[PDB]
Write an enzyme that holds these catalytic residues in place. Structure first.
Site, mmCIF file in Angstrom:
data_model
loop_
_atom_site.group_PDB
_atom_site.id
_atom_site.type_symbol
_atom_site.label_atom_id
_atom_site.label_comp_id
_atom_site.label_asym_id
_atom_site.label_seq_id
_atom_site.Cartn_x
_atom_site.Cartn_y
_atom_site.Cartn_z
ATOM 1 C CB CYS A 51 -3.196 36.539 66.040
ATOM 2 S SG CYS A 51 -4.757 35.864 65.459
HETATM 3 O O1 LIG Z 1 -5.987 37.491 61.671
HETATM 4 O O2 LIG Z 1 -7.224 38.260 61.668
#
Ligand SMILES: [O-][O-]
Ligand SMILES: [O-][O-]
Ligand SMILES: [O-][O-]
Ligand SMILES: [O-][O-]
Ligand SMILES: [O-][O-]
Ligand SMILES: [O-][O-]
Lengths: 197, 197, 197, 197, 197, 197, 197, 197, 197, 197
Positions: free
Chosen positions: J50
């Site tokens: 992310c």
């Molecule tokens: O946090 O793939």
């Protein structure tokens, strides 16, 4: 009430009373397994295009039996009206004798199964169905009331289906016995398209 | 989804892209109002009976145009596939140039509206429709895939409907132009039945 | 599809093609407002009890017109079968000429409205309906196929209704013209029960 | 709630309390198997046409019993009201003693099952039913309230059904015993039509 | 169809034919507006407890009228049976002349509306209803078939409701005219309770 | 939630907490099988007509117990409020010690089961039920709030039922023990009606 | 029936009869607009924890009025029981006089709207609601039966909610007046968490 | 989706990932069978009142373990945010290390089952639940966002509920350990209310 | 008919006729079990971006096969059009020989199942799907009609999933073989993050 | 809740709180009309793949802004967690200061609207959407959790769309700025396909 008549599917079963050689006999679609059947509807006894079509098929019936093919006609009239029609001389729009069963669809159930029933008129249009010997429906011809059908065309279609049933080759536009056919393969198809035009 | 095609009712409306004279054009059923129309479906481009039916009609186009009648053909193939087909020499199962429109029915809407769509196959059967100058559906001819249609039969039918439109008489079995016709009433009918015997 | 024929209610409306004095005319229930109508169904043209009943009413038609009462007959047969029946001599189970309209219920709609349609047979049983001049249904007689109806009984019922329509007195079992009637009141009723037995 | 009364189907079953020979007894439709039954409804005890119909039948009971046929009558009145009616001298619109059962239909179940119940009035119309020895409903006669039925017509009908049960022939219009009958087929029928002319 | 009779709601509307002084009059609940009404159902004319109840109230009718109160009786019997019952001497279980209206409920609608109808028997149980001058239902007494009602108790209740209508008081157990009443609030109530004990 | 209380069917089953002899006990309708039961609802503890009815019945309990009958009372009040009321002096509107059980129906299931619940008020109206020894409902008395019931009328009713239960004669209007009864048939009914009254 | 009590939504509207200083007054939720309202349910009058709570609150009612707060208690008990419970000396589990209205919910609709009704018991649990001057629900405390509530906690909460209304700042766990609060943003939150704590 | 939290019913089952001493462990409601559980929701990690509460509880966790009680906090925040919030120094609104499990409810199903989910905000309110060693829900405290909860009140309630479990006696308003309780019956209740109070 | 294609669920089953090495072979999704599959849809044979995509993947097919990965292309065109397209030279927008299967979806079922079908156009958009050796769908790339896909990007994704399949690691933005990976837990993740920065 | 994200239709509208330049701001899809928008979802703050995706896009933002394109990121995390992550050093897996907005979707309405929500996990998967300046969705990229997206591929896609938008030529597989394009018609397609490639 939906039409159950679909090409390449078993033709909708039917049974009823018909006039065969002057008599009332029960007749079933299944009575014709083993043969090709030409099953055709016509509007009304004691009318006009209707005698001519029955006569045209009856007179040429041997051309059909000679290719393992029976013919049955049908309208919404009773077996008693059929028999009176047969007993009216051809001179007064009667049929005179005839070699093709006249099936009776009094309840209208068969006409509805074949999708030829005219809800506003109370009878059928001119619908013709070609059913093969396995009982599968192969061809559907539907004519508005004014225009009669053709025995030659019907003969051609039956022969075409019987041929293609036997060989697996396909029948080009306008095909008659003796005409060129096509191997239904991307390569084998070229024996036909290359050879002629 | 059900067939909207009913004899004596207006033919189901359609529109779509057609290859016309090597070009894509938007074709509507309504462009044919004022003329009779032979509107016919065929299974798949680059197959077999398929080119021979289109060619048969296209090559005889004048026998229809000479009687105020047009011919349009249709399959589920895209307009791009139609053009590539037209651009394939007849010798390879192509069409070569063709004068009758190829209508494209990619969405299957038209095929479904005419009740010729084969759900299990993703294309149509051999379906032919005769639509009059007023847009009314007059004749339905449905063939299983192996067996092609006949230009001559189509012609006879078109001629018959045009005759019975004009003279309000009716055509007996096998009627070809010049043949005897019948006056539709229990009285006047006898001028044909006392004449054919 | 439910029977709409209920006593003391307006008789279900009908319209269709009938054979009147050798011709096809459109006929409507409403054409008989002002008169009593005897409207009766019979199974099939070219059968058996069916000619006799039509003949019995036709031959005695003046007995009905003399009491402001018309008669109409009806079966599921077409107007063409009716006309052929009329044109068959009484010697061959035909009707020969006749003075009563033969209504045609080809679509079966009228028979169903009157609750006489036999779903398994494709025609009606022997149903007779007495409709007064205000168009109200007054009497229903339904006979299984084997047993024909009676003109005398029908005559009696029409006269009884016309009488009771006029006077408001009621008609005892077995009543004929000239018979004793009853004032339908707990006191006035005694003019009848006291006077005779 | 709908009528279950259909010609050629078993008459709708019923049971209830009846006054039989001055006593309350439980009566069932099935008690009459083996005999023909005239089962008839009438509006209200202590009214008008009502006593005269019951009396007419009861007084002629032997003309039915002499042909293996019983008669049962029915109204929505209670058995207590039936008995009080029977216990009223004929001179006051009573019945006096009576030999035919009065069946009571307080719940209206029987009247509804036979489709003779008048929702707006709370009693029946004049409904008569002829049920054969096998329990099958053969004839339905429905009269609006002012007009009574006929013992003679009922008798003719019963006789006709018994004849056509026995000889499997059919009764023409107006058939009374000794009258000509017809053989039900297009061939043998002519022994009546070449005979009545 | 459920009981519409709810205490402290307006009594279910009703109308129908009644025997009032030997005559057939049309009677509506609303005709009694402005007076108290004792409206009661009984099972069947020409039975047992039934005559005695109508008689008991009929004989003591001035006791009700002198307190602005009417009485109406009702059964599922026809008005014609009612009148014959009235015209039957008391010595044979009749009523002889009677001053109370006898209402007819042939359709069973009124009885069902008052929830007193017995589906299995076809008549009512012993239901009695006290309806005030505003048409509000105040009291419901229902008895099984074999026990009759009480005129004395009925009077006491009518008097008590009339009393509690006129005064801001309530009537203790067993209250009759003259008896101690209670002021329905926590403070005023004690003038009754301390006194009594 | 519709009422389950139907006359001559078993009384809706119930169970709950009742104050008995100062203590909380579980009490069930079935506890009373073999005895007649006067089961009655009253609006609210600490009101007005309410204690007088409970006291009137309690103080005269022996008139019920000496005829194989019990009495039970019930409101929507809790068992704790019941007790608190029992521990209130009669002079303050309390019950003082009491010999009939006070049933509690906080959830209203019982009141609703008996069709006596007032949805707009959240307590019952004045509903009394007479349940025989076989647990069959025999009598329903419902009073609007301002009028108390009568112990004398309830006693008469209980005696009447016990008597018809035992003798199979029926009780005329106002029947008290020792009065004339009637034999329930159209003939033995004359013993009572002729000169006997 | 589902709960309508939703935090930060308007408290479900209510009305009914309450006992306010010995008198019966209609009371409305909307009567407390402008003021904070502590609104609590308790199981039953004349029980146990239930009196101590009402007294516990009623005695300290001043601390709520000196912070613009009112209190109302409510149970399924009738107003008449409420009043009787007040007129019962505290030594006998009564309330003695009281400044806190006791609201009556006989119909149970209010308890159901507030999700505090015990379907199987027929009364409520210990449920308390804090409603602001604008009638928005701010807090819901529900206790199982055996455990009573806290005047002090309720007071802490009313103050906390009043503080955050004015200052728009938030109250940490265990906040009593004068305590350190937090500014509701990720910058102004460091004033509380850092250096101070 | 509706709330399943019902007092005196089993607390709605839950499971998911929690941060227990810096680690991710699956956690189940059933893990706390045998022990009392304080189970509370808080709106969001990295906000305001929410950290002070968790700390307020976590610091005093001993007082709960010395009374067989565990605590678990829960928010809609992921386990990864939970852990990050713990690894954030208290001075920056973090939690610092903590003994109280922080449960994760990313899917919101747990909050919805407990009726604490705010549909418009996407997180929960301040909702706290007290669940006994047998897993029955005993108490529900719901706060609007701005006001935090009380460790002391929660402790009072857990004790109160533990006491009443053992001794079966009930806790008055404002009950802290050692306080006077009440015996749950209308006799043994006088020990508390009288002479003592 | 909704898309059945869900990431991390098994890829929607499919089968049909494909042109594999100039021949018509029946192809099932399940035939690729044990290998990765790049399954992609393109709009129409004999169009524009379309040949270039199939060619791009076809030319670089060993790069996929050498990593246990197959490629299949699919459009709504017939297998016959596919073959003619293959037999069309690239210089006229054909494909010339191709090593990638071309799958036919005439029925539109496969396209609808993969949610890539355009109802308004009758063909698909540019949809591509990466399905792992277990048949789990891992990646979905959908492009509007005018932008083609990337073989390079497709390869990177296949390699990354294969990588993350084999190792307990995840692939950061832009990952290609050789690049830094991350250990997906809060502790191990820092070996990646401290290093990188 | 089914996905509203359809290619070549307007992108599902959205709005919510986003962290922008360290502050909470309300942000709306429509704020970006006139610009292309790369709108992408990612699973969870404080995870692994992310931050690298957000950082990869943020650090190369000018490559998007210099072509009239913005980028916005969104997860189900709150805005407070977003901020807390932004205030985490990149070396600890935080974002550090960032130039692309981080949108918050706590209620999941936005994720659900875009078909990227994982019901079993309570957060989204890797979904990227390319929305043109007219707000029409042009491209959808969805990745299972373990594989990050590519900024280079996203740039190519954005450039491709901008180019076909502008020139109305179409982009072949692997098109990067400066590569050969194709004219979208069956004739001008030969410019690209002949010797050009
Ligand atoms: O946090 O793939
Ligand atoms: O091709 O048939
Ligand atoms: O009586 O009709
Ligand atoms: O009395 O029945
Ligand atoms: O209390 O009436
Ligand atoms: O490219 O369409």
């Amino acid at each position: 009430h939906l039409s159950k008549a679909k090409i390449s599917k078993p033709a909708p079963y039917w049974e009823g009373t018909a006039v065969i050689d002057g008599e009332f006999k029960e007749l079933k679609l299944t009575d014709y397994r083993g043969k090709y059947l030409v099953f055709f509807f016509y509007p009304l006894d004691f009318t006009f295009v209707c005698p001519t079509e029955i006569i045209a098929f009856g007179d040429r019936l041997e051309e059909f039996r000679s290719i393992n093919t029976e013919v049955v006609a049908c309208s919404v009239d009773s077996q008693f009206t059929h028999l009176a029609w047969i007993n009216t001389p051809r001179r007064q729009g009667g049929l005179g004798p005839i070699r093709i069963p006249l099936l009776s669809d009094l309840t209208h159930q068969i006409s509805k199964d074949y999708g030829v029933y005219l809800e506003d008129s109370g009878h059928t249009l001119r619908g013709l169905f070609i059913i093969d010997d396995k009982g599968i429906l192969r061809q559907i011809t539907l004519n508005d009331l004014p225009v009669g059908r053709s025995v030659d065309e019907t003969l051609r279609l039956v022969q075409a289906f019987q041929y293609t049933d036997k060989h697996g080759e396909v029948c080009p536009a306008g095909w008659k016995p003796g005409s060129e056919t096509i191997i239904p393969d991307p390569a084998g198809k070229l024996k036909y398209f290359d050879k002629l035009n």
